[PDB]
């Protein structure tokens, strides 16, 4: 068909958003976020969970696609997550028509809590010790916080999951702390610097 | 007596174990599988999820394993057990009845999982010999001179019962503490073919609707 | 270059064949559709219960074009699902037998249903011609 000829030259993301010209804003995420893979759909179910750093081999978009089916009511549903991801990407490209990939990457870069904190047992005296956060660890924490805020949005609201996800992604791209993930990153930095 | 299932490997190599379950265990059945894991030395386990048993056992066999135990249950509590000795060895299929749970009663110390001391009590008939050799070749070869972990098999009234006891050689005698589960174990078949066959040579089946099996032990 | 119902879509050709039957008009639908739910495992009645029988007949014609022959057991299990039996586990049930037998009689009226080899359901020259006409009408659905 016509879109078959269109995608025959440029392998866009589902032939609706270009899978090129994606940029990572924040530093310390190069080789921690997979954005160099030209693919068609985020369901490449090859064996990547076996190793530690092979989890960075899957795309962060495919990581969020796995994060959609993270609930008792939906653990193991694939095409529901894929269609919801396509709807959320269309909602992002409607709210911000630059690129769903670029806007999502900007939100991921702006939703990162740069510091961490640990509770040390101390032999019976727990204390708050500020510690660093690893690159893939920070990326996974941001993705998890975003998916959790999106899931917590659709508790008493007729809004679609794609709609709440796009609203949280817009709040994270703005960094306005109007989403749970951005509020969580701000509170995490505040707590880490509270006991630095 | 050592058998063709054990003659080339009885005291030669010390064994490893694999503990698993039939399909979708209940939580307490998993906990009991944990107990039978931590009782045995050389203890490694693996959950069975959506696995074809010829594929599972065949894949476990090239990786190298001496024996495989797998369980059953009835609405939370376990009832059955089988042992499959890998190198074409005999599968044995038992009914297990009672249990005490280390989680349930108290934390009474530790299952130190040292190469334990072995006790097989009151086995006379050649079937008792088969059970003794098959079960002995699952424990570790080489406990020490004073290995304080005494495992105990008792064969009174066709219901072999197992406990674990830990002893210290106190002033006038040993003193023991009760650990591990306590059992009412009873077999009902022996097949020299491994369970992957489903049709091979059954050594032994318990006659059930035979009159005299009210009285008689060992068929 | 060859026009097939298999090339045509599910919802698109389903609506097209249902409208063509509605354009045909005569199908002799049962009177039970005013009260039936088309299955025992169904809970509410069909929303377009007048065109539900038409959609079922269109799907049956599509199956008869795809497969050689089918039966009322095959149609019922094909058009069958689970049940709202309460809280106990729901197995899959079949569809209504009398509705299936009436629909089998309903498609031989238009000549779409014929007795297959060793009995069963097949298509005729009139049924194949009507299917080809509906498919060619749906072949021009690309505008």
């Amino acid at each position: 068909p016509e879109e078959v000829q269109q995608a025959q030259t440029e392998i866009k993301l589902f032939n609706k958003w270009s899978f090129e010209e994606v940029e990572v804003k924040d530093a310390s995420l190069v080789d921690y976020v997979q954005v160099r893979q030209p693919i068609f759909v985020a369901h490449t179910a090859g064996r990547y969970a076996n190793k530690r750093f092979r989890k960075a081999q899957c795309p962060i978009i495919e990581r969020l696609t796995n994060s959609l089916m993270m609930n008792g009511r939906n653990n193991g549903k694939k095409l529901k997550a894929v269609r919801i991801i396509k709807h959320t990407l269309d909602i992002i490209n409607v709210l911000t028509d630059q690129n769903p990939i670029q806007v999502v990457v900007d939100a991921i870069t702006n939703t990162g809590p740069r510091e961490d904190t640990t509770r040390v047992g101390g032999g019976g005296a727990a204390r708050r010790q500020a510690v660093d956060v690893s690159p893939l660890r920070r990326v996974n924490q941001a993705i998890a916080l975003l998916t959790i805020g999106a899931r917590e949005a659709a508790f008493r609201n007729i809004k679609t999951i794609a709609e709440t996800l796009a609203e949280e992604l817009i709040n994270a791209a703005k960094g306005s702390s109007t989403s749970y993930a951005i509020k969580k990153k701000d509170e995490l930095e505040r707590v880490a610097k509270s006991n630095r | 007596q050592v058998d063709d299932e054990y003659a080339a490997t009885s005291g030669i190599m010390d064994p490893r174990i694999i503990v698993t379950t039939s399909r979708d265990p209940s939580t307490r059945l998993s906990q009991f599988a944990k107990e039978i894991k931590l009782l045995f030395p050389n203890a490694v386990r693996l959950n069975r999820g959506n696995y074809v048993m010829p594929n599972l056992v065949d894949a476990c066999k090239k990786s190298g394993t001496t024996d495989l135990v797998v369980l059953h249950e009835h609405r939370g509590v376990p009832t059955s057990l089988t042992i499959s000795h890998f190198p074409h060895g005999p599968t044995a299929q038992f009914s297990l009845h009672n249990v005490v749970m280390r989680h349930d009663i108290i934390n009474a110390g530790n299952q130190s999982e040292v190469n334990p001391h072995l006790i097989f009590d009151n086995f006379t008939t050649a079937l008792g010999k088969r059970v003794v050799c098959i079960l002995k070749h699952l424990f570790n070869a080489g406990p020490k001179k004073d290995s304080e972990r005494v495992i105990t098999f008792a064969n009174r009234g066709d219901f072999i019962s197992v406990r674990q006891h830990v002893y210290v050689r106190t002033r006038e005698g040993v003193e023991i503490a009760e650990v591990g589960p306590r059992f009412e174990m009873r077999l009902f078949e022996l097949r020299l073919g491994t369970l992957e066959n489903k049709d091979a040579d059954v050594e032994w089946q318990l006659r059930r609707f035979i009159r005299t099996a009210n009285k008689k032990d060992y068929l | 270059p060859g026009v097939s119902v298999r090339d045509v879509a599910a919802q698109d050709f389903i609506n097209a064949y249902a409208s063509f039957l509605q354009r045909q008009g005569k199908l002799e639908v049962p009177g039970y559709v005013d009260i039936v739910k088309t299955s025992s495992g169904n809970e509410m009645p069909p929303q377009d219960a007048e065109g539900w029988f038409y959609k079922r007949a269109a799907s049956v014609a599509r199956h008869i074009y795809m497969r050689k022959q089918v039966g009322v057991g095959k149609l019922n299990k094909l058009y069958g699902g689970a049940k709202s039996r309460g809280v106990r586990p729901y197995k899959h049930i079949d569809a209504s037998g009398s509705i299936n037998r009436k629909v089998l009689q309903a498609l031989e009226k238009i000549g779409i249903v014929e007795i297959s080899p060793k009995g069963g359901r097949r298509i005729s020259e009139n049924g194949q011609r009507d299917l080809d006409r509906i498919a060619a009408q749906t072949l021009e659905e690309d505008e």
């Binding site: - | 005291g11 009590d121 080489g142 099996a213 | -």
Partner: protein, 40 residues
């Protein structure tokens, strides 16, 4: 009426105590059963 097989035998403090004292012997005299290690 009659019985057809022998199911689960109930244990008590006495049966456990009997097996208890016999194993108190059976390590008190330090007789012990084991796999034996073949050379060559």
């Amino acid at each position: 009426f009659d019985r057809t097989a022998k199911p689960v035998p109930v244990i008590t403090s006495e049966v456990t105590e009997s097996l208890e004292d016999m194993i108190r012997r059976r390590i008190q005299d330090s007789n012990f059963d084991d796999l034996q290690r073949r050379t060559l």
